[PDB]
Design a protein around this ligand. Structure first.
Ligand SMILES: *SCCNC(=O)CCNC(=O)[C@H](O)C(C)(C)COP(=O)(O)OP(=O)(O)OC[C@H]1O[C@@H](n2cnc3c(N)ncnc32)[C@H](O)[C@@H]1OP(=O)(O)O
Ligand SMILES: *SCCNC(=O)CCNC(=O)[C@H](O)C(C)(C)COP(=O)(O)OP(=O)(O)OC[C@H]1O[C@@H](n2cnc3c(N)ncnc32)[C@H](O)[C@@H]1OP(=O)(O)O
Lengths: 427, 427
């Protein structure tokens, strides 16, 4: 009983004022529909849009939407950062795995979910494609669903399936999926990649993010074997190790033989690989990012990044001071699960500096109001282009000492000073 | 094959220089043995003593031990704070549940464990008594064990049992157990107790700490029923609700009908109640403080405290700035498990002020270097003598607004100002 709209605007029309909306996130962001909402919303007001990291939705961040629509972010992105920092949008800190629960528990109502799916099959089944994340949970509690049928959306295996009769409206058109290739090789990335690579043992169950660092790391694993994959997301980097036989998920205990993630992002080759591939399972973040599940696999290797780290090991990765940059996500859950896993190891990899090399990512103390995503007690390894530091079980003076050893040499002196002047530690 | 020493000094004598020692913590701190070590250690050197919160061991913090023994704290206490702040002792941040793993994984070696147990029974079995915590794990990997047999130590049920042949030395004498009655009723405590009490539903599975706040809360639960108990520790407060029938552990799924904790601390009546009591189970912190286990019980109610909270919800509870006050402990694991539990709720209860009322516990931003124990994403409820604030799913401006509403009115104006000047939020 879904209405087959002839235009995106016709589909978005059902949205009424004051409604709380949810949008498919990541590579699945319904750009086609969100652009139509960029106009339709002009006639509405009090529209709240819940979301995670979004791609190609900068049309909804145009000043003309101020007063009609407001973004409510569980994770910031390129089109929302300026709005968050300018106080025009709202940032709600929350573990990614907790998002599905917030919806299902009814704590956060959702009037309508905007999503992008693959065309319905003989059974009328569609797929959430490259992004299952928390949209599946949103579609469960959503008052109504507005779907955009895109023949380009791959039919991913796992929990991304949903029946077309659960849709109030439907608009079909082939559109491009954001390939996202903003990454780029670098001298520092290679260095960090090499260091991390030495911590990776054969049969390890990987978990990583996107970027130069992750890629550099993956490029140094072409010699390992029987590696597994249980991550929040994956890109082309992984695809290459799979075709090399390096990855086979043979040593995992939870869904062995198959790759598991909450979503994917990368080139068309990747989307082609995950498309209707029995070996790739896109699972609901409430599970994939559940420490209780992650710990089930032995030798988990969790590799994440950060924005700022203090001489004590407190990790900040969702913001720079009081200005929100991204979000909590799920690096913490993976870092803990990694510690609970048999022989598991975690690693926080980041460049020793930033802003061109004038700012040290390893500061003596976190900037006033810095959002702590991962705490002292959580941290295991921290790597930089200058080496690795193991803080597990190490005291404050031991941690500070090891950290300043991987910090850029242009800041060693300062860091060492504040080690005693600020923390009162004598190395 | 244990050696029956005739004096505490004779037992401690086996300890040799350069050894890494572990001591029973909390109410089980082997004062009798530790006082003998206060002297014997004078002839040794390079002695490291790993520990948690200790009681009555201030003799080991005497300047005369500097150079011979050094404290390595996983959690600070009264006799160690001055040493930590003065850089004479070491503080190792770590989740309490992770301590057993650090020992078992062999990451942290232990040459000898000093412990206090109940006399051996017909089967030669002794009990770790009121403190199981991580000592059980320490006794597992310890090179040798030096036990103090105390007829006053209650024979607790659970995992505190150990055979006397696992001891290298043994000294027996009846000694007093620290009753710990430092708590004291207050106007603010009562207020906070009342507010928290309203969040507690019947059949809730409680988890709390010691102090005026917890007691005030317990005194307001004399009207509830079918309450359960799965906590890090408990005191006289709980004992009173048990004899009132209010607590019966009938609604728990993990060890129903029985009280569960890692340790106990309170008057002789309490130690008398737990003594050989089938209904009270002292379990290993690796389990009791395991979020994977805590979440198994529905309607978990986790009530903890804090030292400083920022307008965003970041919780600091192990220190004041860069000076370590206590430790990470296990409030985070309980707060998360509480969120994962069906209908579970957590609450961070603390006085709106401190230092006589000149310092606001709710600061616009955490003090430079403040140890974050519980993060933004973790927090659910925060209560003060002025009410409660729900941050779950709330944005930064919503959180700041709610927080300043329970902050002492003498700081509302300042807090509200920095809400825009520091965080750039407009309420
Ligand atoms: S499902 C997976 C989602 N994520 C998680 O679960 C955990 C959260 N992680 C993240 O958001 C990203 O992994 C972080 C920690 C941001 C690292 O990612 P990026 O690699 O994409 O970001 P950059 O390091 O390249 O930084 C972007 C800009 O900000 C500046 N900058 C970095 N660090 C600092 C510090 N400490 N102080 C001031 N500025 C800092 C850089 O200049 C950088 O510049 P651009 O021009 O924007 O590229
Ligand atoms: S196994 C369970 C143990 N705990 C955990 O797992 C979690 C960690 N928490 C704790 O150890 C305690 O719950 C904390 C958070 C310390 C609160 O406990 P206390 O109630 O015992 O401590 P007080 O609140 O009474 O504080 C002690 C002294 O320090 C001053 N003070 C408190 N807060 C501040 C701030 N924000 N700024 C400056 N000073 C502050 C008080 O004046 C207080 O005075 P005393 O005379 O020492 O009592």
């Amino acid at each position: 009983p879904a209405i087959v709209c002839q235009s995106a605007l016709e589909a978005v029309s059902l949205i009424r004022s004051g409604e709380t909306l949810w949008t498919h996130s990541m590579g699945a962001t319904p750009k086609v529909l969100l652009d139509a909402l960029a106009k339709h919303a002009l006639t509405l007001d009090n529209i709240t849009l819940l979301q995670l990291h979004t791609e190609g939705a900068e049309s909804l961040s145009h000043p003309s939407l101020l007063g009609h629509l407001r973004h409510r972010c569980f994770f910031g992105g390129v089109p929302t950062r300026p709005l968050l920092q300018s106080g025009d949008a709202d940032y709600v800190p929350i573990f990614l795995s907790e998002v599905p629960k917030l919806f299902r528990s009814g704590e956060q109502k959702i009037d309508t979910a905007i999503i992008q799916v693959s065309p319905p099959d003989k059974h009328g089944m569609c797929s959430l494609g490259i992004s299952v994340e928390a949209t599946l949970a949103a579609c469960q509690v959503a008052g109504k669903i507005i779907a955009h049928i895109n023949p380009q959306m791959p039919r991913t295996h796992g929990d991304g399936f949903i029946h077309i009769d659960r849709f109030a409206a439907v608009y079909e058109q082939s559109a491009s999926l954001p390939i996202h290739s903003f990454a780029t090789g670098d001298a520092v990335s290679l260095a960090i990649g090499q260091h991390v690579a030495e911590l990776v043992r054969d049969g390890d169950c990987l978990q990583m993010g996107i970027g130069a660092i992750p890629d550099a790391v993956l490029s140094c694993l072409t010699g390992h074997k029987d590696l597994g994959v249980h991550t929040e997301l994956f890109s082309d980097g992984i695809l290459q190790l799979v075709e090399k036989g390096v990855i086979n998920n043979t040593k995992k205990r939870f869904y062995p033989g198959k790759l598991v993630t909450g979503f994917a992002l990368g080139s068309q080759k990747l989307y082609d690989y995950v498309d209707d591939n029995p070996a790739v399972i896109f699972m609901d973040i409430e599970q994939v990012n559940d420490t209780s599940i992650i710990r089930k696999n032995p030798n988990v290797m969790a590799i994440n990044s950060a924005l700022q780290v203090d001489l004590t090991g407190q990790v900040c990765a969702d913001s720079i001071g009081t200005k929100i940059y991204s979000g909590v996500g799920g690096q913490m859950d993976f870092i803990r699960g990694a510690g609970l896993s048999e022989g598991g190891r975690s690693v926080i990899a980041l460049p020793s500096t930033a802003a061109g090399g004038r700012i040290s990512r390893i500061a003596s103390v976190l900037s006033p109001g810095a959002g702590v995503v991962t705490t002292r007690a959580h941290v295991h390894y921290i790597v930089t282009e200058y080496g690795a530091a193991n803080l597990k079980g190490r005291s404050l003076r031991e941690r500070a000492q090891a950290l300043i050893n991987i910090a850029h040499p242009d800041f060693r002196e300062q860091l060492s000073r504040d080690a005693f002047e600020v923390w009162g530690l004598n190395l």
